[PDB]
């Protein structure tokens, strides 16, 4: 099972990407409606 | 009830253990197929009347069948054609709902009544009556590799050895042969004939008296002589079994007393019953069989079933004779099976890793990866037991729902451990705390879900059909999801979390926890001080929403639908046709060509091609041809450029090149009975008895004014096929009664010599086979060889054909059509771009509207159930929506409180629609479904922040803003839990290409983008819904 | 004939005045023929186009161009009930007593389907009566067998 | 549904022992209530068909349709739809030598729809160019036709 | 309902009618069914408010 | 009065042949015999519809 | 036998064989169905297998 070990490595390394992206649009999205007041 | 099993958790376990026992076994008793059953159920009556011409076909057969078909039940509509091969087809097509069964029987009884109506010779052939299909679970071909055996002798083998072997197989439902047993050949030659003072008709009355089975009767049989001894059977004559046999027939002993044997004025061979269809794979001649799965059958466990009959007959293959599969559908849905197992396993460890990323202990991680089997488990278990099936639909619907059942287990356990964090209660009274706070909102959700999907099930006809597949998939593992979430999870959350000190937010560990906790309470703190200030400032926020809504609406509008993706199904088909009156050897050169373009510009992509000279879908005939071309797996052909669209375009691009053909290739339809979401389907009807030229001309008016709105209509197109040549010959009765030459031995001497006669049958090696008179090619060709044929007088006189008939060309009908009994012409076309099917429709409506008196139209097929089920949608919606407004003033004890969760809804809708207007996809059903468990999961996250929010207000007295920062605060994190693990575990449909991938990014795409969105704007969007619904009410 | 000349033939039965028009301004052939023997005047003349003849003919089709069973436009014209189009053939030369292999002349088809005005023109541009086809049989014995007493009178 | 198969099943054991002419004729095998649901009656208020024209127009145009509707069981014309009606005289077939059985043989073979094959029909000669339908005799159309008839 | 569809049906015939033709209705079972019953209809609305 | 064996050629074989896949089927059996008579006989599951 | 023969059972034998055949798993689901419930009754796993 190459794929089974394929999918883990992806899974972890994708658990911190997408993360940080959703994470970086609210604060970014919330500092926009700051500003947007 | 959570209450009841946290204090029951082996009652919990035991509940849990039946479920996956049902489960599993579910798991090995549910039927696998492609797809379910979609088409409206369809019978279709067949017959032959050999050379006979469309309109003898009409006049005799078909008008007295239709005549009949009174008295049946739940028939919506009825359509023929009769076409120039002396071929008729009816096809009844029946209410949706109607039993198959009984529709068949009622059709067989009322032909078999009409039978004694119609003509000898169509009677002999029989007219069959069976159950439209045109699904093939795959399609063996047989050929033969070393030039000893013709298609005629690949068939009969194939007949005599094979097909019965896999009519037995398990699972096998259907089989047919692509070719013909042979056939006793008696090939005349009216030299010979009128040498001798004989006829065709000599002939014919020879063989029915040579070739015959005579009853005789018994030694010693009842009642006997007293005394008797023995009692025995005697047999008399008996059929013919060889060639050698028909040969020796007597026909005249001449008055030297000499003997004329049938071998002295014919030829004789075993041969094919027609000639119609030559059938080559990559050039060499081919039988086949085309095998149908049955009821309730597993398709992998058949195809495999199949195999292996087939392995164990090749040892006795004849040499040069070899099995190629160009058609299986096998393989497409062993992948389809593997990705969706594949899938929900990601699913399962991604929860996995997002439960350890915010919870940092295994006891929780463990929670959700036994809920969520558990949950799926049970849902096949009720699928099964209403007899669902494992295809493509349901398939997808299970991922669809991964969302919602994964939501269930995060929000129940997270809440768990918030409360532990902030109260420091021990894991039982917290579970017990926790589910006192939500127990209520999960049941509310169960209603608002089951209103949103459950209507769709509800729809009518094909489309209804497939929107059920996924209703009842997707409510079914909802309700599943539910009853865990109530029993299981609150017992294990009990019994397997560890207490949590209070206060402790993480915030004080060491490495990587203690920093994404520090981390991410700063976030959360950022978030809610963004929320205050929107919150101070709400008119702004509204401006804001609608600009949203009305986005919402232009994208949506926009976005031109369709009903279900194009795939690489590793075949593609390629059309070939001819101008009129093309012969059937100029076919098969154009077929050549074809055939030798994929094997060598498509030498990498292509396994196969199996040109069918004779078949085409618009009509058959000598003049059109397909060429069915099967594809290297798709593991070969990597790289957009080697797929079946990209290899499609350059071979019709390649082909215009083509000149006196029209020769293009297309991909298959995923669904071969849906035709186009942009197409319509038009019947154009004879209602005063206008005849055949009038109808045409009325037709070709029509045409003409579709042509004048491409802004409107595109493609409209006639189905069938044009007047051509054909030979008028006239028999002069006058000199035909002068000459003493009687009018039976001209026509039969004519239809035998030119069109053959099924005579009788014989028995070649124990199988009963027919045996057919006509003339050999050579005298049958011209006009000239008319004057060849003799028939004798009453006075012995051998008169030729020339002395009594007069010739002359004219045009007529290769193919009639009728409608509901009256003749017809079929019309097709779509929706030029950016106009709905509904408009062109109604344009086609106007044209029509503006015919001839006695013209007439009907709309059938495709546009029958758009007409009638776009009827429906309307009122579908409104009783959604009704009920879930319903359920939510029920949950909140409110009639206003729930606009703030309804307003939730376009949220999750735009991003979808961005989603997929950039990456150039449509509205077709997986992107509409997709847009349902988007807005599902939206709407539950909404759900539990006004519950938590009003609950605050109602039960600890805190004002407005405050109940709602606070609400906000608590939903964060399992929002944003569900959101990470449904998008990445949703992330690999998106990117995917290779097998099944179209339906796998139509999912994928809407699903990913909805869910950004929707996740994004929601958290800040519904704290302001929630505050100014509060405000204004 | 050519790739013109398969356009004419299709453009000539459809009844398309204006690509007939094109064709002829491009020398697509006049006297293609498909494998009955039929010339783009056949089919303007079977089907009716009267327009379409008229111009074909001004282009030196050839009027009495005969199919593979020996019948020309005329016959077609005139068995079909296109009263102008016989009329204009005849203005151009069309023989009025060809038969075709059956020995059928254009009154005896004209006399069968029991067209009145035709069977006049026939006869006023020089049709014989007595023209009998291969069973011996003339326009008038058509008419008694029918039963036309009105045509039956004219033949007298 | 099933009291008409299994009668039916039973029926179809007995059809090839009934006369030809009741055969011919069709035998029917409804399941339907006793008493008329509807009468749709048809009248012209132009006077210009007569009540022989109304019966066939309804016959050919409107009958077979509701026939078929669904939940019709049986659909009783009053009238009757036009056939070709050769009304004998017997002076003038005895003054020509015939029968009633004579007439009869011509139309069945002078009123023939039949099956002549093509032109170029497969299996073909190398290098056919012609492919054809072959048509000869058909059904007559008009009482001109049949009363031609030699 | 076997009735509506008849009408139906009947309904596609008669643009194509020659001239003159007209459907009568000399003999219907179903009009005292639909009435009979909406007569009962009434005498339950009439019930609630009294 | 055909014989067993032309019975069974032309007509047992006939039938069975397009027996399959009928929905529920255990097993058929069949007796051709020498007074040209067949009776083929389906099976069915316990608990099919006859 | 020779090669090429073989048998099979049919009418009141076949269903012998069946009923036979599916005994051990008769016994098996429904020991597991009696110790299920009795876990659920007494709540505890161990009544259930005293
Ligand atoms: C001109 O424009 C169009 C556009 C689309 C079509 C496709 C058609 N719906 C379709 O059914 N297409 C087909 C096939 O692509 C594939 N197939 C597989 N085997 C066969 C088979 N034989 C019996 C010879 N015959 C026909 N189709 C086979 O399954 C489907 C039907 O059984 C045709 C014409
Ligand atoms: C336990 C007290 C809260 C009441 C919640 C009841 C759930 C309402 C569901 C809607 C039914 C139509
Ligand atoms: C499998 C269902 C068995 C029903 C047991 C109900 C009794 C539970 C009460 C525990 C106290
Ligand atoms: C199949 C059920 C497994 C049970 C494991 C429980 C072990 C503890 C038993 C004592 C509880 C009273
Ligand atoms: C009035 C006390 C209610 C007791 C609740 C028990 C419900 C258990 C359901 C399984
Ligand atoms: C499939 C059987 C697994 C049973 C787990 C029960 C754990 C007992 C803790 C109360
Ligand atoms: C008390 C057990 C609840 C049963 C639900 C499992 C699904 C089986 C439905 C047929
Ligand atoms: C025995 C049938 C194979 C079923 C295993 C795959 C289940 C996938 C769930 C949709
Ligand atoms: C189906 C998952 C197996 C159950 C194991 C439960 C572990 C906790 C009990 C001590
Ligand atoms: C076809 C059924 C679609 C129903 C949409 C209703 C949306 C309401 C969501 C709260
Ligand atoms: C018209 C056929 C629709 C059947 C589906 C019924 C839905 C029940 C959902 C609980
Ligand atoms: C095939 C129609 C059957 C409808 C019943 C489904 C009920 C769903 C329960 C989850
Ligand atoms: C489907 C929406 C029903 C509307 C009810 C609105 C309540 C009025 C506000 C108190
Ligand atoms: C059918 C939906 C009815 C909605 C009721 C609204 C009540 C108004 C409360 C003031
Ligand atoms: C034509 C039927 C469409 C059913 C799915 C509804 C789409 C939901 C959009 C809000
Ligand atoms: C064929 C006999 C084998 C029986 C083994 C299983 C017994 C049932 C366990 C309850
Ligand atoms: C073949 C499977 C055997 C299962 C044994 C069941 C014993 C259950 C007692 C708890
Ligand atoms: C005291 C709770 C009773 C639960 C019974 C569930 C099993 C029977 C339907
Ligand atoms: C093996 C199937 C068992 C069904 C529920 C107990
Ligand atoms: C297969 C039918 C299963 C229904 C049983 C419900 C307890
Ligand atoms: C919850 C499942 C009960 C329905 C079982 C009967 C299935 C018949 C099609
Ligand atoms: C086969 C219909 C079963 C319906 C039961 C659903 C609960
Ligand atoms: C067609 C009436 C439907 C009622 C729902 C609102
Ligand atoms: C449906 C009643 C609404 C009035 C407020």
């Known amino acids: 099972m190459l794929e089974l070990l394929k999918s883990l490595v992806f899974a972890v390394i994708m658990v911190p990407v997408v993360m940080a992206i959703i994470l970086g649009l609210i604060y970014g999205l919330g500092e926009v409606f700051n500003i947007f007041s | 009830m959570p209450n009841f099993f946290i204090d029951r958790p082996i009652f919990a376990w035991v509940i849990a253990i039946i479920i996956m026992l049902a489960g599993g076994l579910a798991i090995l008793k549910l039927p696998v197929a492609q797809y379910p059953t979609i088409a409206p159920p369809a019978v279709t009556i067949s017959a032959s009347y050999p050379g006979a011409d469309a309109k003898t076909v009409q006049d005799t057969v078909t008008q007295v069948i239709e005549q009949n078909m009174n008295g049946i039940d739940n ?17 009844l097509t029946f209410e949706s709902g109607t039993d198959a069964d009984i529709a068949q029987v009622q059709v067989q009884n009322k032909l078999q009544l009409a039978m004694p109506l119609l003509p000898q010779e169509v009677q002999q052939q029989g007219v069959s009556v069976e159950k439209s299909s045109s699904s093939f679970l795959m399609v063996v071909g047989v050929i033969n590799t070393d030039g000893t055996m013709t298609q005629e ?84 004559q008996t059929r013919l079994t060889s060639t050698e046999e028909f040969g020796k027939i007597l026909l005249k002993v001449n008055q030297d007393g000499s003997r004329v044997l049938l071998r002295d004025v014919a030829k004789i061979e075993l041969g094919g019953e027609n000639y119609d269809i030559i059938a080559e794979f990559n050039g060499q001649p081919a039988s086949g069989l085309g095998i149908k799965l049955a009821t309730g059958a597993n398709a992998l466990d058949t195809a495999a079933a199949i195999r292996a009959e087939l392995a164990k007959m090749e040892p006795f293959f004849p040499s040069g004779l070899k099995i190629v599969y160009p058609y299986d559908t096998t393989p497409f849905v062993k992948i389809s099976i593997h990705e969706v197992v594949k899938t929900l396993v990601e699913a399962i460890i991604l929860v996995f890793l997002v439960m350890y990323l915010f919870l940092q ?58 409360v532990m964090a902030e109260e420091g209660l021990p894991p039982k009274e917290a579970t017990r705390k926790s589910m006192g706070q939500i127990q209520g909102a999960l049941v509310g959700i169960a209603m608002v879900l089951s209103a949103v999907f459950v209507p769709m099930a509800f729809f009518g006809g094909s489309t209804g059909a497939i929107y059920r597949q996924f209703s009842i998939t997707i409510v079914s593992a909802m309700a599943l999801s539910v009853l865990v979430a109530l029993i299981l999870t609150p017992a294990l959350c009990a019994t397997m979390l560890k207490p949590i000190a209070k206060g402790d937010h993480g915030e004080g560990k060491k490495g990587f926890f203690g920093w994404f906790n520090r981390m991410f309470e700063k976030s959360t703190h950022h978030y809610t001080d963004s929320v205050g200030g929107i919150l101070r400032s709400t008119g702004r926020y509204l401006v804001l929403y609608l600009i949203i809504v009305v986005g919402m609406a232009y994208l949506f509008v926009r976005l031109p639908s369709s009903f279900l993706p194009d795939e690489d199904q590793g075949v593609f088909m390629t059309m070939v046709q001819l101008p009129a009156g093309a012969t059937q050897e100029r076919t098969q050169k154009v077929l050549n060509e074809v055939t030798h373009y994929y094997l060598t510009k498509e030498k990498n992509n292509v396994e196969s091609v199996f040109a069918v000279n004779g078949f085409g879908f618009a009509g058959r005939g000598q003049n059109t041809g397909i060429a069915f071309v099967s594809l290297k797996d798709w593991a070969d ?28 290739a297309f991909n298959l339809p995923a669904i071969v009975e849906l035709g186009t979401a942009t197409g319509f389907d038009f019947e154009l009807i004879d209602q005063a008895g206008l005849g055949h030229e009038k109808l045409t001309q009325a037709r070709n008016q029509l045409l003409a004014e579709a042509a004048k709105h491409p802004d409107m209509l595109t493609s409209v197109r006639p189905n069938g096929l044009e007047d051509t040549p054909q030979f008028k010959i006239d028999i002069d009765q006058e000199k035909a009664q002068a000459l003493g030459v009687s009018i039976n031995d001209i026509n039969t001497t004519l239809g035998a010599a030119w069109g053959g006669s099924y005579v009788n049958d014989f028995i070649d090696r124990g199988r009963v086979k027919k045996v057919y008179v006509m003339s050999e090619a050579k005298y049958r060709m011209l006009p000239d060889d008319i004057g060849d044929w003799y028939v004798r007088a009453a006075d012995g006189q051998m008169v030729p054909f020339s002395a009594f008939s007069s010739s002359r060309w004219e045009y007529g009908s290769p193919r ?55 009827n429906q949608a309307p009122s579908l919606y409104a009783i959604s929506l009704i009920v879930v407004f319903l359920c939510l003033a029920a949950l909140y004890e409110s009639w206003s409180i729930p606009f703030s969760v309804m307003l939730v809804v376009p949220l999750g809708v735009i991003g979808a629609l961005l989603a997929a207007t950039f990456r150039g996809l449509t509205n077709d059903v997986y992107f509409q479904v997709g847009l349902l468990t988007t807005i599902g999961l939206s709407a539950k996250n909404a759900i539990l922040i006004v519950e938590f929010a009003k609950d605050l207000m109602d039960k600890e007295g805190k004002g407005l803003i405050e109940a709602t920062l606070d609400a906000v605060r608590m939903r964060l994190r399992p929002i944003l ?57 | 004939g050519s790739d013109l000349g398969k356009k004419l033939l299709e453009a000539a039965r459809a009844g398309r005045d204006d690509e007939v028009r094109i064709l002829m301004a491009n020398g697509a052939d006049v006297n293609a023929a498909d494998v009955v023997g039929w010339t783009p005047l056949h089919l303007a ?51 009025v007593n060809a038969k075709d292999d059956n020995g059928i002349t254009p009154l005896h088809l004209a006399a069968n389907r029991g067209h009145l005005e035709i069977v006049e023109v026939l006869l006023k541009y020089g049709a014989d009566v007595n023209a009998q086809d291969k069973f011996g049989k ?8 029918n039963g036309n007493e009105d045509l039956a009178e004219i033949l007298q």
Do not use: C
């Open chain 2, 75 to 91: 028939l919506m509509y009825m359509s023929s054609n009769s076409d120039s091969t002396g071929t008729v087809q009816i096809t």
């Open chain 2, 153 to 236: 002798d690949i068939s009969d083998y194939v007949a005599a050895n094979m097909k019965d072997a896999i009519s037995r197989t398990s699972g096998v439902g259907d089989v047919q042969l692509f070719g013909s047993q042979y056939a006793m050949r008696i090939w005349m030659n009216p030299n010979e004939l009128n040498k001798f003072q004989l006829t065709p008709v000599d002939v014919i009355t020879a063989i029915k008296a040579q070739n015959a089975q005579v009853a005789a009767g018994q030694l010693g049989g009842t009642p006997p002589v007293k005394g008797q001894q023995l009692n025995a059977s005697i047999i008399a």
């Open chain 2, 361 to 418: 202990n295994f006891r929780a991680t463990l929670i959700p990866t036994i809920a969520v089997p558990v949950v799926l488990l049970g849902t096949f278990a009720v699928l099964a037991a209403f007899g669902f099936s494992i295809n493509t639909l349901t398939m997808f619907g299970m991922v669809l729902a991964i969302g919602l059942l994964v939501d269930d287990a995060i929000v129940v356990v997270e809440n768990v451990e918030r």
């Open chain 2, 637 to 664: 052909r990597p790289g957009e450029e080697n797929k079946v669209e990209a290899i499609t375009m350059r071979a019709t691009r390649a082909f215009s090149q083509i000149k006196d053909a029209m020769v293009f």
């Open chain 2, 816 to 870: 009639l059509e009728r409608y509901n009994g009256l003749p017809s012409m079929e019309i097709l076309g779509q929706a030029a771009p950016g106009k709905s099917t509904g408009e062109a429709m109604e344009l086609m409506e106007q044209l029509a509207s503006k015919l001839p008196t006695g013209v007439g139209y009907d709309w059938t097929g495709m546009s029958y159930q758009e007409r009638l089920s776009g």
């Open chain 2, 977 to 1033: 839990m569900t959101s990470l693990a449904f998008i990445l575990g949703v992330m690999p449909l998106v990117i995917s290409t290779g097998a099944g991938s179209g339906a796998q990014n139509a999912v994928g795409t809407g699903v990913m983008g909805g869910m950004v969105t929707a996740t994004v704007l929601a958290i800040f969007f519904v704290p302001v819904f929630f505050v100014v619904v509060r405000r204004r009410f």
């Open chain 3, 45 to 95: 003349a079977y089907w009716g186009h009267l327009e379409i003849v008229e111009v074909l003919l001004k282009n030196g089709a050839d009027v009495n161009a005969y199919d593979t069973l020996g019948s020309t436009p005329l016959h077609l014209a005139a068995h079909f009930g296109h009263l102008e189009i016989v009329e204009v053939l005849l203005k151009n030369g069309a023989d």
């Open chain 3, 138 to 145: 003339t326009a008038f014995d058509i008419s008694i067998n």
